[PDB]
Amino acid sequence: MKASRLYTLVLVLQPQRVLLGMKKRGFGAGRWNGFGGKVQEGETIEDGARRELQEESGLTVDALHKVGQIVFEFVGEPELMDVHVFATDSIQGTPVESDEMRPSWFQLDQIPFKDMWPDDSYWFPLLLQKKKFHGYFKFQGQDTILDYTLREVDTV
Numbered sequence: 001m002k003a004s005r006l007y008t009l010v011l012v013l014q015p016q017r018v019l020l021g022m023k024k025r026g027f028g029a030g031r032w033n034g035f036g037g038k039v040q041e042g043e044t045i046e047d048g049a050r051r052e053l054q055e056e057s058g059l060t061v062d063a064l065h066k067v068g069q070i071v072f073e074f075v076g077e078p079e080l081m082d083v084h085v086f087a088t089d090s091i092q093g094t095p096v097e098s099d100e101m102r103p104s105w106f107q108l109d110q111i112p113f114k115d116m117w118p119d120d121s122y123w124f125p126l127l128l129q130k131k132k133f134h135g136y137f138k139f140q141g142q143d144t145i146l147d148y149t150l151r152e153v154d155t156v
């Protein structure tokens with residue numbers, strides 16, 4: 001059985017648009033993602049998701065709501081990524097471009113799936129339907145899924 005490391009992912013989802021962040025630099029440049037990072041010692045997962053959103057994008061929120069949980073496994077990496085997925089419609093402030101990340105809104109008929117993580121094509125449609133989900137994806141590298149499971153759940 002592998003060990004897992006906790007991560008967060010926040011989708012800034014409004015009725016007609018979603019805010020995503022593009023990686024500007026390095027391995028994975030050009031890919032659009034929600035906002036998040038590693039959970040730190042002593043914080044709740046939800047508080048870590050809020051902190052990461054603020055650190056990564058400049059945005060604050062009053063509340064998040066949990067919408068999913070996805071485990072990622074990469075070939076060659078013994079540690080699983082346990083990603084806790086949150087969404088909010090209610091944001092404070094404007095998103096900020098950093099040296100690492102450029103934020104941009106996309107209309108919900110222009111979701112840039114080809115330039116997102118491949119798994120997003122599977123679970124983001126559930127998020128748009130206000131469904132909750134559990135997922136697992138095994139990757140060879142950044143582009144290829146070798147195995148995956150996705151299931152709608154009533155409780156995350």
Ligand SMILES: Nc1[nH]c(=O)nc2c1ncn2[C@H]1C[C@H](O)[C@@H](COP(=O)(O)OP(=O)(O)OP(=O)(O)O)O1
Pocket residue numbers: 007008009010033034035036037038039072083117118119120
């Ligand atoms: N397959 C995938 N699909 C997806 O939609 N988001 C993914 C993903 N794989 C990783 N992510 C997201 C999860 C999380 O928000 C982020 C990865 O977190 P990072 O390792 O960048 O965290 P930190 O910035 O805390 O790490 P440090 O490098 O240690 O500072 O990318």
Ligand code: NA
Pocket residue numbers: 037038052
């Ligand atoms: Na971090």
Ligand code: NA
Pocket residue numbers: 036037
């Ligand atoms: Na990061």
